[PDB]
Amino acid sequence: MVERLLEIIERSLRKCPWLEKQSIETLLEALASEIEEVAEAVKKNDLANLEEEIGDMIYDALLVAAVAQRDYGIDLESAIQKVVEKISHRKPWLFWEEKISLEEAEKIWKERKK
Amino acid sequence: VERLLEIIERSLRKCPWLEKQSIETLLEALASEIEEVAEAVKKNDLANLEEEIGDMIYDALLVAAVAQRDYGIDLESAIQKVVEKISHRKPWLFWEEKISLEEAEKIWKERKKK
Ligand SMILES: [Mg+2]
Ligand SMILES: [Mg+2]
Ligand SMILES: [Mg+2]
Ligand SMILES: [Mg+2]
Numbered sequence: 001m002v003e004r005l006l007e008i009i010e011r012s013l014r015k016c017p018w019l020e021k022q023s024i025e026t027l028l029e030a031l032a033s034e035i036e037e038v039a040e041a042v043k044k045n046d047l048a049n050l051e052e053e054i055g056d057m058i059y060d061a062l063l064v065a066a067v068a069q070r071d072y073g074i075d076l077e078s079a080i081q082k083v084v085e086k087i088s089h090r091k092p093w094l095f096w097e098e099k100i101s102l103e104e105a106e107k108i109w110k111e112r113k114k
Numbered sequence: 115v116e117r118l119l120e121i122i123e124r125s126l127r128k129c130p131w132l133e134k135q136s137i138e139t140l141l142e143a144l145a146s147e148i149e150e151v152a153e154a155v156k157k158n159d160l161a162n163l164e165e166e167i168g169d170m171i172y173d174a175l176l177v178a179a180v181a182q183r184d185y186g187i188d189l190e191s192a193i194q195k196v197v198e199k200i201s202h203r204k205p206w207l208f209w210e211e212k213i214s215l216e217e218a219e220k221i222w223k224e225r226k227k228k
Contacts, residue, residue, distance in 0.1 A: 001190060002115070004197050011207040017215040018204075018222070028152050032145060038177065039141055047185060054181045054189070055196030061144075061174040064151065068167050072160060076167070080118055083168030087121055091131075094124040102130040109131075 005059060009066050024067045031060040118172060122179050137180040144173040202228065 012019045034057040041050040068074035090112040125132040147169040154162035181187035203225045
């Protein structure tokens with residue numbers, strides 16, 4: 001439940017004395033760390049742990065978002081609506097009925113990029 | 115927030131590039147965005163930070179998407195594991211009055227044992 005997680009993150013901005021002391025840098029490293037926990041769990045086909053680390057990973061990315069807002073005034077809805085513009089623009093086939101071949105998709109993508 | 119998960123779902127459905135990506139490859143894509151974030155922070159480049167923050171949430175969520183695709187992992191249960199974990203480790207987030215760093219850590223230290 002994503003909302004529950006964003007509420008959590010809101011409560012941490014407002015209340016948490018550990019979070020107050022963390023820089024985006026530090027959080028960035030926390031995130032690179034969970035990425036490693038995820039890679040290890042995939043390696044072991046450890047499904048219960050994979051599920052744990054996926055959650056850890058999303059939380060930690062979202063804590064980087066939070067402090068980007070805290071410290072740099074980055075709005076997450078803006079940051080999100082932006083990446084959605086980019087994707088939609090680059091990969092227009094996402095909104096097209098018939099699937100298209102990898103080669104078709106790339107030729108498009110090569111051109112969108114620029 | 116939601117248009118982004120619809121986007122991701124559309125990629126699971128349609129995208130011939132995403133079919134060819136493994137969670138390892140994608141973990142690595144997230145690691146690289148994290149670098150781009152660290153960089154826009156360095157340079158107090160606000161427009162770019164907003165960019166990369168977005169890139170990072172999307173890519174993180176694409177790692178989640180392939181965890182589901184390839185390993186069966188349900189994002190709602192994964193988020194729920196992490197909501198329970200934090201609620202257990204940081205009970206102060208649901209307490210009215212604030213608490214000190216020193217207080218929060220003593221607690222966290224013990225809750226970590228469970
Ligand atoms: Mg972590
Ligand atoms: Mg973890
Ligand atoms: Mg990327
Ligand atoms: Mg980027």
